[PDB]
Assembly symmetry: C3
């Protein structure tokens, strides 16, 4: 029960600043106290400091940041600690997943997101890297990426070993890429049809039929409906509700196989208050903004926090 | 893949004006662009212009309008186009359903509504025709209706060939009429028990056991909860949520048997903004009012719009 | 079809006043008219007037009030009327359940609440009695309670004959007490997994396998999410939604075995307006605050109010 905390305040994968503030905000709201009360020990590593495609915005900053995160996380993973990577925008998942994958070759990835993040640079409508991160991680890029030379000999994630859950806002080209690469995906309609519980069980059975693989959770908070998670940059209607996202994290915790996790796209500057109700019982700052509080609660779930 | 668009701005079935503005509002919000992007071709026909019961309000206007709609829609139906009838209050469904039924004798009707609209004039607490339209269409009226002589020799809809879905606000007398006429109905409690997916599958199996009948969808937007669809005149708590109504329309689209549809009771004057989030990706006007945007999205669903 | 109405305006089980106003507020909103329209007859009894543990706040007032409620309710129960006990905070459930249990020895209790209310005085973080009421009723208290001598020879409720439904905010010690006493409990996660319908059927099957026992419903309105029930003192995120709580009450009504019920923790001073929509059809005051209106609707459900 040891967790390494890595702050990855990268904001270069998308237009806005805001997400660079997420790591320190969650600490301020009570990350350490929450981990403590759940009976885990932590080591907080602090924050990461900071022929070719030519159409990815801010790629130099992203590439240089990613090398640093990769090296730092590799070192934490070797301790056999659970590693919690707090973004930052979703661009931080590249180094997170690949570092975990080099150590855990049979890693299975659960990517929880309103979006596919599976554009390649030639299909992206925005040129924003956080909308391409999963495609990059899956080895789908067709040319070299500036400032990513350090990554060129790594083993990439396989689509059949990945499940994307919660998606509802996919670009025209992404729809094609999604079907073509044969990744396992579960849309909000699948969830409405079958329920979140059946959905995650189906996904886990599909990617880990023998229930014996390490799991990495990459959680984009915009998977959650805006009613509960307004503090995020790219909102899509009809998201996971409060009960659903909490249950999803609980079920993943109960596998006992989660080895690493990203929590990304939390933007405190866009967050709002309820605020404080009696049910906010975790040692989280009274009256905290609701998305930040939800992030801490979902981290608690992964660490075993349960109702009874 | 051809759709005829008919604007039916009838507001005489209920107290308020507002719904007469719906047709042009949806055009302004991007109806044509939405249809175009989905790979359909449209023909926009424009807007319909405008011993006995003596207790139906505004019946002259309704009767005269209905003759015009019946004649106009009959002509579009003969083209074998999908026909989209945009109200207007629900009173427009009489001519819509009966014109479609004369052409498609084995038509099956899915009536999606918070209400039964199945009062007869002698049981109506309001005298408002939009609360009687389904009863009229089902041949339940017991006396002649002024200005409906043109309709007296038509074949009427049969209750066993109809399913009402989403109901939750039914008048005392309506409850009796509903049970008596043996229509198939699925309340919000049935939906809460079984889920929207099982519910529509059950309904379709009940009215079209051989999966071989043309389908008409009569969608009253007040079936949807006020949180998502405030722009409507008669609100009932506990409606379909955003995910549910989208899934329902998707499942109906996937039958490949929908031949005509009403979208009624949208009142732009009562609508509100979110507004614009990234997920609003259809070519719908940025920052559109939320009910209008939802209407366009649900039309998109019927035309095949899907997440992946 | 006779109901005795007892107002139990006890506010001493928790810090705030407010709940003492609930009984008269529901009468003002139309309790009598609602009962009348459902074809029931009522008798409104009015309002109840008003070695040892030394750490229960306000226990003298609570103990003296409880003797009065016990005596008053015992008398109503003997009439073989359905007895409706309107709080007041949840402290009123002690005398309510025990009086009903002395008469109906095979009583089964369905406790609907965001909370367990199953602290004992030595584990309570607050010293507030309304957070201990279920533990007291279950005979879990280990010392005598001041001003409860009148209750010392009563038969107490058994955990195996009880089901708690909707829970989500449980204290650390409560979690242990809950597991230890072997009460049947169904958390909001169980409800999210299986749905409210399967959940209540499972609970009823567990505590009343032969479907032949009288049922007492103890409904704390804070079981319902704040979106629908803001008028309550102790809010917990992720509660039952409007559709769920209505369906739950309907299913319990349909057993035909409910003999008594508490409706507690409604605090009009914390309530808010929508307000009035067409769907508010019960004879409830136009524009009533939403929690009060919901309380009346849920009482209607127990008395047989249904959609069709
Ligand atoms: C338009 C879009 N698909 C948006 C991606 C959103 C990134 B995320 O998961 O927060 C793109 O820029 O590629
Ligand atoms: C009271 C009422 N049942 C209301 C009908 C609502 C019409 B609708 O579906 O928008 C009536 O006037 O008959
Ligand atoms: C902290 C708490 N568990 C709160 C109990 C809430 C009572 B209720 O069901 O409304 C306690 O005071 O024991
Ligand atoms: Mn993402
Ligand atoms: Mn996203
Ligand atoms: Mn209608
Ligand atoms: Mn309606
Ligand atoms: Mn309680
Ligand atoms: Mn409670």
């Amino acid at each position: 029960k040891n967790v390494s905390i890595i702050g990855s305040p990268l904001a270069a994968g998308q237009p806005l600043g805001g997400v660079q503030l997420a790591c320190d905000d969650l600490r301020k709201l009570g990350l350490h106290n929450v981990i403590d009360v759940l009976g885990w020990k932590y080591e907080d590593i602090g924050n990461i400091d900071n022929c070719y495609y030519d159409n990815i915005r801010n790629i130099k900053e992203i590439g240089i940041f990613s090398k640093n995160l990769f090296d730092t996380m590799s070192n934490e993973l070797r301790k056999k600690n659970f590693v919690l990577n707090i973004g930052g925008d979703h661009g931080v998942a590249f180094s997170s997943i690949l570092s975990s994958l080099q150590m855990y070759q049979n890693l299975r990835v659960i990517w929880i997101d309103a979006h596919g993040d599976i554009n390649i640079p030639e299909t992206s409508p925005s040129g924003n890297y956080h909308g391409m991160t999963l495609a990059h991680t899956l080895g789908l890029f067709k040319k070299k990426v500036p400032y990513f030379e350090w990554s060129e000999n790594l083993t990439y994630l396989k689509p059949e070993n990945t499940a994307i859950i919660g998606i509802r806002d996919i670009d025209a080209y992404e729809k094609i890429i999604l079907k073509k690469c044969n990744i396992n995906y579960y849309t909000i309609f699948d969830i409405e049809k079958n329920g979140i519980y059946n959905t995650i069980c189906t996904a886990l059975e599909k990617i880990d039929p023998n229930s014996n693989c390490p799991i990495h959770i990459s959680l984009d908070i915009d998977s959650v409906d805006n009613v509960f998670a307004p503090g995020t940059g790219t909102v899509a209607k009809g998201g996971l509700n409060y009960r659903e996202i909490n249950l999803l994290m609980k079920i993943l915790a109960e596998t006992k196989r989660v080895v690493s996790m990203d929590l990304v796209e939390y933007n405190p500057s866009l967050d709002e208050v309820d605020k404080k109700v009696h049910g906010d019982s975790l040692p989280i700052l009274d009256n905290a903004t609701k998305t930040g509080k939800l992030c801490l609660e979902l981290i608690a779930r992964v660490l075993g926090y349960d109702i009874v």
